[PDB]
Structures are given as C-alpha cells and as structure tokens.
From a paper:
L‐Asparaginases (ASNases) catalyze the hydrolysis of L‐Asn to L‐Asp and ammonia. In contrast, the chain of ASNase from Rhodospirillum rubrum, reported here and referred to as RrA, consists of only 172 amino acid residues. RrA is homologous to the N‐terminal domain of typical bacterial class 1 ASNases and exhibits millimolar affinity for L‐Asn. Crystal structures of the wild‐type RrA, both with and without bound L‐Asp, as well as structures of several RrA mutants, reveal topologically unique tetramers.
Author numbering:
A (entry chain D): 6 to 170
B (entry chain C), D (entry chain A): 6 to 169
C (entry chain B): 4 to 168
The structure:
Amino acid sequence: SPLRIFTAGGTIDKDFRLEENGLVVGDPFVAEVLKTARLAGAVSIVALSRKDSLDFTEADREAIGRAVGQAVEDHILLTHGTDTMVETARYLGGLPELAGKTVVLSGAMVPGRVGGSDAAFNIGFACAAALMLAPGVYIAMHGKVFDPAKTRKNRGLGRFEPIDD
Amino acid sequence: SPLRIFTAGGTIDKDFRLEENGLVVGDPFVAEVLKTARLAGAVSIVALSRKDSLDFTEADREAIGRAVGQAVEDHILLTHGTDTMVETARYLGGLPELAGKTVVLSGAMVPGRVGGSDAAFNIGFACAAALMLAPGVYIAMHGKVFDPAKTRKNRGLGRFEPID
Amino acid sequence: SPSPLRIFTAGGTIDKDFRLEENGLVVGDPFVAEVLKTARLAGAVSIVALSRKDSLDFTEADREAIGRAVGQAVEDHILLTHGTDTMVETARYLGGLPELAGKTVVLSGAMVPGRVGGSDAAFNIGFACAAALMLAPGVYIAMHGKVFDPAKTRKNRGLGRFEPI
Amino acid sequence: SPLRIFTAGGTIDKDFRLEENGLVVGDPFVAEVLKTARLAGAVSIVALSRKDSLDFTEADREAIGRAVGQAVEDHILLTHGTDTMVETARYLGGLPELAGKTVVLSGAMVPGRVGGSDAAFNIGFACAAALMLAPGVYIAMHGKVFDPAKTRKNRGLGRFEPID
Ligand SMILES: [Cl-]
Ligand SMILES: [Cl-]
Ligand SMILES: [Cl-]
Ligand SMILES: [Cl-]
Ligand SMILES: [Cl-]
Ligand SMILES: [Cl-]
C-alpha cells in the first residue's frame, strides 16, 4: 500500500498490567484496529517508542523525524499521545526530508483497550486523511484536520482547539 | 465543509432481538461510533430505510437517489449493506442531481454490535473520504477507495475487488 | 487440583456467532470457553461439546443423547449450556433419569449471544458454575441470578425470562 | 434469599479519566454487570468507599464492618480491591454482628471497563456463592472459594493462593 504507519505509544496504546494494578504503554492498538479492518495484505507497522507523555524525550522526537524521513512512502500515519502531539507535529513540519510527504498525527483521548474509546474511528479517519491530503503535517482528531501551527491541546476539555488569537 | 450522513440499514446496523432470538436491522450504528468520536462539528444522520439485502427493493434504491439529490451538502456518507452496495453506487453515479457532490458508500461485513467488527474503522475512513475526495460516487471499504463501475463484491471472500 | 465441575455444551443463543458468507448468526463455538479463558481459573475444568443446535433445530434424539452423556460423566457437578426456549423440557427430562441421582446438574445459557454487545452470558456462566459446585443433588436452571426448579418453571418468550408457573 | 451488595472500590471499578490521562476508581462496575443480567428488580447496591489498594485505610475497613453489620440481609457480597481483600475478610471474620451472615468478597484482577476482564464472571460466581454458602466470610475468585485465614494474594502472579 502507499501508506506507512508509525507508532510512538501514548494514551491510545495503554493496557492494564494486572501484576502492577495499573496501565502501561502496550502493544500498538492500531494493529488491533487494522486486524479487523479486512485489509488486502498483512498488517504492517513500525513501532518507534513506547513512552507516555511524562517520559517522552526530545531524543524520542528526533528519532521520529529520522524514521519518517527515511520511509519511501509519501503517505504517513503516526499514532502518538495527545499531550505533546502538537510539539511533535510542529517539529516534523520544519524537516526538509518531509517536504513531499503527507504526515498525519493521530491517537486517542481514551485507550483503545478501555470501553468507549475514540481510537478505532480516529485510526480510520487518520488513515484516509494520510492518503488524501496534500503534502504537509496535520493532526487528525475529532473528525477533522488541524494545522499544528494554529492548534493547542486543551487537557481539561480533552480536545484540540485553535491557539489564543 | 459539512458532512451529512444517510443510513440505509444493512449488516453494519444489525442488532439482536430477544423475541426473534435473532438479528434484525436495528438503529444506525454510525450514531454510536460518532457518539464516542468527540466530534468538533455537528453531523445530521438521516435514516432513509432499515432493510437488509434480502428485502431492500429497487423502490428503496430510487428513494436514496431522491434524498441524496435533495441534500444541500456536497459531502455525503451513505451506510449500506455490502451485498448490493455496488448496484446502489452505480445507480447514484448515473444521477445528474449528484453532480458536484462527493458521495461515499460504506458499511461493514460484521455488524457493529457483534465482537470483531470493521464498522468503527470503516466509518472513520469513509467520513474522511466523503470530506476529502473530489466529486463522484465511491465505495470506501478495506481502507481503500473503489470506483463502483470497476468493482464487485466477492460473497465468499467477504471482500470488494476490481473486476479482473 | 482439578475442578469437581464438568461443562457440557449443547449450543443455543449463548453460542451464536456471525458468519460473513451467510450475513447472519449461526450456532458457533461454545462461548463458555471464551468466558473461562479470561476468568483466571484455579482448577482444571473439561468443556465437552455434545451438540451445536439452536432451539428451532433441536430434536428429542438430541435430548436423549444429552441425558446419556450426563449420566456417563464421573463428575457429580455438571453445567450444561443450552438454548433457553427448550431448557425447561431438557431439565425436566434430565430430572427423570436414574443415572443422574447423585449429581448436581445446572442448565444455563443467555438471552443475548456472548458475542453480541450487552450479553448476560459471562454473569450467567459465573453464577451457574458456582451453582453447579454448591447446590444439593438435583437438576436446576440458573438464570436471572436465581435458581429455578424446572418442574415449577417456564420460559415467558415475550418477557425473555424464566418465571414460576 | 435477598442479597445485599456493597462496593468498596478497587481494581474492578477503575475507569479512564481522559482529563488526567489515567485511571481513577469510578462508578461501581457491579452496577454495569447487573444491568445486563436481566434481574427481576432494579439494580440496588451500597457504594461505601472508592479507594484503591494504595489509599485504603484501617478506618475505611472498620466503616465496611459497621455497614455490613447494619444490613438486615444474611447474604452479603462486597466488591473490593484484591491486594487488601484478605485483611478485610479476616477483620470481618472477627465481628460478632456478622455471625449468622454469609459474606463473600470478590473483585477483579483487571478493571471491568478494560477488555479481557474477569469481572463479570467473578460477580456471577460470587453472587451465587453469597446465596449458597453456609454463614462465614469467604473470598470468591478464580472460580473457587477461599478461606481467608489460609489465603494470601500473590501480586506477581495475580492470584489468591494457600499460605501453605
Ligand atoms: Cl500519553
Ligand atoms: Cl444487509
Ligand atoms: Cl436457541
Ligand atoms: Cl441471524
Ligand atoms: Cl485496588
Ligand atoms: Cl493510570
């Protein structure tokens, strides 16, 4: 397919580890969504890192820039935590190796393995956005496309919204 | 630009009824998917019919053409059963009142209310396709866009594929 | 330390599964195996499939075959998963068999298939397993978080519930 | 015959709060399991406290003893976190107001709102156990009944086991 999928952990991939009575960043949830989507080929993703927003580092962010630049595909999906998605998307937007590529960041406010998740919808929408949008770096959430330069995460209302005018 | 959703029943919307001890075509599952999607914009969901592929008629297919034609929006998602999705899509492609509209048909091989369903992914994918594709009539399934004129449903593989 | 419990499956609503090629439900693999897989059980328990019928296709020959299998079991604690529409008739028939004299036999199932959202199946299986281990010798129906005497019970098909006669 | 159900929080009740990106102890999951169990009457529970195993106190434990002793019912289910369950069960075992009551503690190693949870099976089994066992205090987990004086939680293996 023309699409390459990268994962950088975050809320979307959280799973319960019963040995510590708490969530960890687990197996990439996009693999679980694509498993039941009846795709033509084997499910194929790249798992870059498995951090949550607290232990994600600038080194982890540069590693994403290098992985995406080395991909041969020009249509790119990156699943990520929402708390520092804008920071990653603005960083990728300044990399010249990404000039001709459509790069879409998405994830979920609720882990896929928790009831009532936005994850599967967001993954479908984001896959289609990555295929169909003109070259650029975008955030796809809430069934819409956000310009990362003009967007912030509101942690309190769990949503992306326009920056302060 | 705003999306309008029309529903025509099919597998995607099947639900268990205790008294039938069996499935019936239920409330549109797209509304359940959009509920947990934390949407930025308002989306109208209009139910045109609640049939399965066995009791969906040519009269039902004409009624969908009339409702899509009367829609003010140029971005339309229609949820439908897969067994005759190609026939509906080919019919809508022939209608002059759909010039300038992007109309995407989608649905699910497995009911949304059954474990292991393609429905939520296919709804996300088809919503974006309806917003982003140029005017025309399309089928969005298997994370791909199909041209209805060059596509068929393989019943046994439970897949859409190119003719040839 | 093996469970005193043997589980027999005879099909019914509990086990219904969606088949793509038919665009509808068929009686599938026993849902009790899926529930016990996530139950973290202490004791080994045998699940034996006797039949894969719904209540519409069930015969007097099938019921006689179920009575022979239960009677031949070594265990004195038996769970039988079954459709609800013919449960009372199976339970009354098992109640008449001398080979079942020393045994606790509990029939249960679900009004909604395990594999459909909003199912009573996992609750019913937990309740019925405990009932089969703890009740005095006899034949019982376990549904609605209660124990029913088959001779004094019927299925109200309209209300989708077992009730006193 | 009548069962009284009390909840004290723990793993079974954890729910994701998207405003903090983490789990909190939430609405008692037993209400969700009983909702789909098609019971004869309204689902009725007593929500005593909403601690996890790390914030639960000997005062919270004594408050459960007072609540269970005030119940008119002689069949009692208490949902609880597993890491503190043996100490609660042993404490209730010592209370004279509980002498003629069957008191069953249960819960789940995985929250009910996370996929692949033991919660619904465990509630079904423990409801039956509370109705059927002789007076005493018991832990119902792993499809069997444990004597709390002879039992410990193995945190690493997520299981109750004999001391042994
Ligand atoms: Cl995160
Ligand atoms: Cl259909
Ligand atoms: Cl049946
Ligand atoms: Cl069916
Ligand atoms: Cl806990
Ligand atoms: Cl957490």
